[PDB]
Design a protein around this nucleic acid. Structure first.
Ligand SMILES: [K+]
Lengths: 231, 238
RNA sequence: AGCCCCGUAAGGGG
């Protein structure tokens, strides 16, 4: 029950573009085989990188060999890039784990999340850019239950979606440039579940850990909703 | 009919403290109006601000009776010393000539122009009460409901139920920028300070006028819980 | 994140 976030370190002028990255990824999916992956990209010009998250084993085993085979090779992610390395560790945004390990802990009443790219949500046939507890966490829990081994008990789900508040928020909305008339939140938000039982706190820490892989909200396949947990 | 926001230009050092400022204000009401301390919905809002050495305090009144019964005492404070936490001398009592001073009427809140958009600046920490817990994210419904509720409470008109639905259920966020800051109440919490542009899509012009009115009302009523302490001070921007 | 009270339980008052 492995999960993986593979970082492609890129050599080339310019920066990767979401439509190119997604289309390029879809090519590999056609060749090689709710979304069980997510995409991202980041860094500055000349120090850019792309990332592929894989949320189910079938996909890791299918795609990972195929990302490795591109080391040293030139791909198009908008502009042309030389993939200098495929990283599973040694990059802040690269990692590998298992589902059970998401439940490591320690359990905490608080969950600090950094939103590294514009995050928004589909709601009432509209894109909403505010990182409200219930959105962040329903989104995370929906995917974790979809690809993980556990279904949250109903009381726990209730606690997370109906009870979690915000302790602190810091940030701003930015344009989502692939979209018409859509903004997304960037910055930091610390969520707090009061009266959290140990189990609830555990589930909350797990959702926080899963965010790093699955990301948060809508159009993660375009690199939106890229998030990670912090101390 | 009338809304008024009077600003006390303060002399002395530091800033007013929330609990001291509210203490001071209920001190003044104890003689004219001891009923309001226990009323679940406040016919007023307090505020303070400024750099240190240029501090000011704010008394906002949402019903005429209080203005009548309170304004004279307030004006009488010119020249004299008040305790708003730290002691200050009251230098002036302004209705005009200060950014947070003003007067208007309820009808005049509704004189447009009506906009599908309402940009609010939250100038002091803004937060809300939900399930015995504090929530500092200014969601469309939380803000507009708190404005609308108090408009209906103290004002001459209630919005049609479809306009209410449009405002509450279908208004969204177009832009948000800011951060939470500490907020001392009877219990310590935090609240949002910064700027949010709200947008009601498919708004009828009526709805669009009610939205602009709520925006205008915010200047006197502030937003959310504990405006009695100076929290939720806000105003509409362009 | 916690006390008291209120509350077509949404949110409010101290
Ligand atoms: K009161």
């Amino acid at each position: 029950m492995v999960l993986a976030a593979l970082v492609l370190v890129l050599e080339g002028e310019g920066l990767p573009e979401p439509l190119g990255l997604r289309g390029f990824f879809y090519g590999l999916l056609r060749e090689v085989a709710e979304n069980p992956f997510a995409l991202g990209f980041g860094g500055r010009e000349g120090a850019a990188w792309a990332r592929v998250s894989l949320l189910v084993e079938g996909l890791y085993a299918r795609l990972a060999p195929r990302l490795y085979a591109l080391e040293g090779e030139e791909v198009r992610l908008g502009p042309p890039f030389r993939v200098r390395a495929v990283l599973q560790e040694g990059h802040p945004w690269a990692g590998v784990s298992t589902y059970p390990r998401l439940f490591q802990g320690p359990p905490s009443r608080d969950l600090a999340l950094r939103f590294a790219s514009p995050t928004f949500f589909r709601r009432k046939g509209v894109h909403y850019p505010v990182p409200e507890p219930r959105l962040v966490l329903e989104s995370l829990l929906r995917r974790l239950e979809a690809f993980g081994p556990l279904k949250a008990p109903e009381g726990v789900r209730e606690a997370l979606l109906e009870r979690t508040t915000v302790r602190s928020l810091e940030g701003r909305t930015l344009p989502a440039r692939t979209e018409v008339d859509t903004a997304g939140f960037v910055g930091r938000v610390v969520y707090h579940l009061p009266r959290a039982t140990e189990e609830e706190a555990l589930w909350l820490s797990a959702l926080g850990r899963f965010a790093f892989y699955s990301g948060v909200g809508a159009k993660t396949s375009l690199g939106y909703g890229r998030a990670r947990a912090e101390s």
